[PDB]
Design a protein around this nucleic acid. Structure first.
Ligand SMILES: [Mg+2]
Ligand SMILES: [Mg+2]
Lengths: 306, 305, 306, 305
DNA sequence: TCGATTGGATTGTGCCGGAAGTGCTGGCTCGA
DNA sequence: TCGATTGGATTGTGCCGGAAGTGCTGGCTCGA
C-alpha cells in the first residue's frame, strides 16, 4: 500500500534523499549499496527520525539487488566519480548494465530516476538495458541547474526563490543551455527588471556562469553538492508518486524534438502518475538551437566511449 | 507569537481561522459585530489544534478592544451584495469605525482589506487608520489569478501552480487580464497556442470565465469563500514569515501607470516590513488603456461614498 | 493513481473536509449531495485553492450515487439533523440503506468512515447494508471527543495540545466514557499534575463535563461544530491512505470485547493501509466497564427504533 | 526573521541546515573552525530553498563575529570519540571560547548544546556565556526516547510517534529508562505486556538496544547524525514557534530530584520565552536511585575538566 | 601472494583498534 | 392541487429576484 522507493546508491545524495523521504512520509525506503553494512547503518539512524517527523516509513539497508523486487520508484546515484573523467565511462556503463538487468527482472514497472554522471549518457544506457518504457525513465538535470539560476536571481532581486522561473536545457554539465529569453520573476519577464536597472546584463551573465560553475565552486570550497541534488530528485519523485503533473526539466528520450533522435537530453517535461505525461519542445531560436545541438553532440561523444 | 485579528467572522473568516491553525501561523481573534457567533466558531476551530499539531489560541470577540497588539488585521466585515453603489456609503462608515480603532490600538499592524469594492475600501481604511502606505493592501490579484491559473492548468493538464499569470488594475469586472504575461512551467503561453494545445479563443473564454467566476459560483447556489480565504492567508503568511513572494494586490499608486491618490492592483513583494517593492509593469498602449479603465471605475465609485 | 475520496454529504463538515483534502493534496474529491447544484458550486470554489496550496486534486460536485464508482475512501455525513431526535432514526436508516446498496455495487473495496448521528448506530446500519468487511468501516467519535478533552487540559496546563493524550470510549454522544485514569501530559500521568496542584480534581471534572457538552456549547453560541469534526475525519482518512498506523479511537464492530457483540462501539484502533489493523481492548476496571455497558445499551436502544 | 547560528558545521550541522530550510524556520549561519567547508555546505543548502518553497538565507562562516544577533545558537563543535575523559579538558576550552562570544554578541539567544558529554558541557557553556538558566538546554532525551519509541512501535506495529516514553537523568550509558512511563496511543504499556503483545524481557532488550544505539550504528560503519539533527530541530522549532512541547532535555537542577549545581535530563516545556516549565517527575525509590547514578556520573566527569 | 565495490567518521577509507586532539595508521581477515 | 432531498448566502432556505442594509419574502416552475 505504501510506495517502495529503492535508492541504488547510499552515498551523500542517497542519505539526504532518505532523510527527505521520511520528512515527507513519501514511502518505504531501501538504501542499497554494493558497499557492505554502511547502508544498514545509515538506514538505522534515519529510521529513528520517523518519530520527530510524525511519519511511518520503513527505512532499511541492503547489499542485495534482489531488494529491487516490487519497487515503485528506483533512484540510481551509484557509480564511479573518482580516479580524464571519460575513463570512468566504461566502468559506469558496466554498472548500468548490471542494474538494468535486475530492473528488468525484478521491477519492470518501476519509475526510474538516473543521477549517475554524465547523466544524459547514463540514463540512456540504463534505458537500453532495463527494457522499461521511455515514459518511465528520466535523468536529473534541469531541476537542479535551474534551482541554482532561480536562487541567484532571487537573491539579487530580493524576492522568493520559487518566484523566479527559468529553463536550462540540452544536457546536465558544462554544455547546459541557459535560456535568457525564458527567465521570469513573479511571472514578469526578467528584461523588465533589467530595464528598471534592478539587475544588469553583466550581472545576469555572471549569474549564468555561476550556475554553470556551481558544482566546481562547492568542491573548491572542500564540500560536495548533495543537499540540493537530493531535494531536486525528491521533487521529481514526489511529482510522480502523488500525480502532481509538475512541469520539470529532466533528461528524456528525444524522438525528433530539437532535430535529434536516439539520444537523451534535457527538456521541460510533465511528471504525473503515469510517468512522463508530456514532453514539451521549446520553440528555440537559431542560436539557442545551436547551443542545444552542441550539448547533444557532447552527450553522443561520451556515449561512444563506453 | 503573532496575533492575527479577523475583523469579520463570516464564512471567509471561518476558513481563514481554520488555515491559520493548520499552518500554526499565530493566535487568532475572530471578531464580529454579530454576538456569540464568533465565540462559537472560535471554540470549534480551537480543537483542531490537536489534529494539526499546532498551538494557536483561537478566541471570539464582539469588542474592537481586542485589536490591541495585533500584528495582522484582516478586514472582511461589511455589507455585501450578490453578483451596486448603495454599498459605498454604508461600508464607508464601517471603514471609518474600524480605522479609528486601528489607529488607537494597533497602529503598527499589517492590514489586509477584503471588503468590497476592495480597491475603494482599502483606500478609505488607509486614510482613516493612519497606517503607512507599505502596511496596508487589498485582496484582488491573488484570487483572480488563482482562477485564471487553475482554468488554464486544466486545459493543458499541468499542476495549477505551474501556470503563472497577472491580473491587474482592479478587483471587479474591469480587472485587467494580461494575456502577454501568461506562462506555463516558465514557458510563454504563446508557445502552447502555436502548438494548438490551446487557442486564443479558448484563452479569451477562460478570461471571461475568470471575470465571472463569483457569479458562476453563486448561480450554483454556493458562495465563494474557500479560495478567497486561501489567497488572503497566502498574503498574510508572506508577511509573517518574510517570504518576499511576488503577489498581485491593491496598493497605493504614486504615479505608477500614470495614476496617483488611488489604490490599484499591481504585483508587489510582500515581506517582513510589509510591501517591500511595488512593481510597475511595462504595459503597452492597449494594456495601459485597460488599466486606465479599471482605475477610472475605482475613482467613479470613490466619488459616491 | 491518485486516491478517489467521495464525500457523501456536502454540508458544513463536507466543505471543510474538501478544503483540508486540497491543503494536504490527499486525493481527488467528489462532493456528493442529494441537493442539486450546491455541491458543484462548493467544488468549483474549492478547486481554485489548489493554486494556493501547490496541490493538484480534482474537486467535482455530484448529485449522482453513480459517482461512488471506484472510490477508495467514502465519508458519509449526509442525513437528517433537524425536525425527539429518535424520530430521525427511521429516516436516516433509509438513507443508510440507499447508500449501502450503492457501495456494494460500485465501490465494495472502499474504506468507509461514517459521521451521520447517532454514529454508533448508523455505522452498523451502513455496515449491514453495504456488505463491506468489518475492517473496512468505522465511525467518527473518539478522535473528535478526545480532541476536546486534550485541548482543554492543554490550555489549563499551558502545554502543546497534541502532548496531552486521553481516551474516550463506548459511544459518541452524551454517554461517552471519559477515562480519567488514562490521561497523560507529555507522557506523564495527569495525577502528577494534580498532586503538584497545577490542576484540581474539580477542574478536571469541569473539563470532562465541558468535553461532553461541547457540541451544545457551540450550538448555544449560534455556531455549529464542523471544523474540528472535519479535521478529525481527515486524520482518520489520512492514516488509512498513507498507511500511518496511528492509534485512533473510533467506532468499530465489537466481537466480544468489553463483553459485547453484534454492536459497534468506540475503542482505540490502529488504522493502516488495510483498514482497521488492530482493535485494542482496554483493560477497564469494573466502574469503567459499567459506563461502557451503559453507552452500548443506549446504542442498542436507539438501534431498536429504526 | 529568526537568525539561527550553527556553531559546528559537521554532519549533524548539515542535516540541521537542511531541515531548517525545509521548514522555512529562519536564516542560517553555518559556522566552523574548518576553513571554507561551511561556506561550501551553505552554498549547496541554499539552493534547496527553491525545491522547498522557502526563503532562508544560508551562509557559511569561520568567524565568531557572525554570532551577532543570533536568536538561536546550536553548539555541536568539539572533539569527538567513537563509542573517554580526555575530551573533558579540551572541550572545556571550547565551551569557554564560545561562551565568551555568546556573552559579547548574542546574550539574548536561546542556546542548545550538543557537545559531548552533553550534561557537563551544557553547564560549562551556561557558566561562561552568562545566559539565564531558562535560555540554555542540552540535547539528550528527545534523541534517546526517539530510539525507544521507534523500537517499541515496530514491535507493536503502530505509528512511531504514538509511543510515548521518558528517558531522564543523563545522555549517556547511565540514561534512566522509565518503564513505568511508557504508553502506546495513550495506553499504559503494561496493558500490552498483559496481553502478551510484548514482554517485559523484550522491553528490557529494547532498553539495552536504546542505550547502545550509537555503538550499533558505528559498528555498521555509519555515524549517527540524522536523528540527532531532527531532535535538535524539534527543540529549536518548539522555541521559535512557541509551541510549548513537552520535551526531555538537560537543564539546570535547582533541588529537583534532590540535586543542585548540575544539569540533568528532565521533561521541560519549551516555548517562546525558553524553558517555561521544568517538570519534576514523581519517581519512586528505585527510579530515584537510577537518577542519582546518572547525575553522579555527570559530577564525576565535571571534576575532570 | 596481494589487493580490498559504486562509501565514510575527526583523521582515511577492504576492516578494526589505538593515538592524538581541528586530528591517520598499524595490524588484521577474506578471497580472488 | 400543493409541496418542495440528507444544504445555504446577509436575510431564509424547492428556486430566483428585489429590497433593505447586521439584513426575508413575493412570485415562479417542476412533478408527485
Ligand atoms: Mg571504496
Ligand atoms: Mg433542505
Amino acid at each position: 500500500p505504501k510506495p517502495k522507493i529503492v535508492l541504488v546508491g547510499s552515498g551523500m545524495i542517497g542519505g539526504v534523499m532518505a532523510t527527505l523521504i521520511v520528512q515527507k512520509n513519501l514511502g518505504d525506503v531501501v538504501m542499497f549499496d554494493v558497499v557492505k553494512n554502511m547502508p544498514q547503518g545509515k538506514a538505522l539512524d534515519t529510521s529513528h527520525s520517523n518519530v520527530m517527523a510524525y511519519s511511518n516509513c520503513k527505512v532499511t539497508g541492503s547489499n542485495s539487488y534482489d531488494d529491487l523486487k516490487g519497487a515503485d520508484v528506483v533512484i540510481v546515484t551509484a557509480g564511479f566519480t573518482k580516479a580524464n573523467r571519460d575513463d570512468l565511462l566504461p566502468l559506469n556503463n558496466k554498472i548500468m548494465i548490471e542494474i538494468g538487468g535486475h530492473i528488468k527482472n525484478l521491477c519492470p514497472n518501476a519509475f526510474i530516476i538516473v543521477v549517475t554522471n554524465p547523466v544524459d549518457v547514463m540514463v540512456q544506457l540504463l534505458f537500453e538495458h532495463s527494457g522499461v518504457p521511455k515514459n518511465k525513465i528520466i535523468g536529473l538535470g534541469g531541476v537542479l541547474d535551474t534551482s541554482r539560476l532561480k536562487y541567484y536571481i532571487s537573491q539579487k532581486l530580493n524576492v522568493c526563490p520559487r518566484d523566479v522561473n527559468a529553463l536550462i536545457v540540452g544536457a546536465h554539465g558544462n554544455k547546459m543551455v541557459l535560456l535568457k529569453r525564458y527567465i521570469t520573476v513573479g511571472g514578469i519577464p526578467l528584461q523588465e527588471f533589467i530595464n528598471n536597472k534592478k539587475i544588469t546584463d553583466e550581472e545576469v551573465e555572471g549569474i549564468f556562469d555561476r550556475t554553470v560553475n556551481t558544482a566546481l565552486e562547492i568542491v573548491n570550497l572542500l564540500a560536495s553538492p548533495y543537499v540540493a541534488p537530493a531535494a531536486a530528485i525528491i521533487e521529481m519523485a514526489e511529482s510522480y508518486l502523488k500525480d502532481i503533473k509538475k512541469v520539470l526539466v529532466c533528461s528524456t528520450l528525444l524522438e525528433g524534438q530539437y532535430g535529434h533522435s536516439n539520444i537523451f537530453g534535457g527538456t521541460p517535461l510533465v511528471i504525473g502518475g503515469t510517468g512522463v505525461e508530456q514532453v514539451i519542445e521549446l520553440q528555440l531560436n537559431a542560436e539557442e538551437k545551436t547551443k542545444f545541438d552542441e550539448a547533444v553532440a557532447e552527450t553522443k561523444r561520451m556515449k561512444a566511449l563506453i
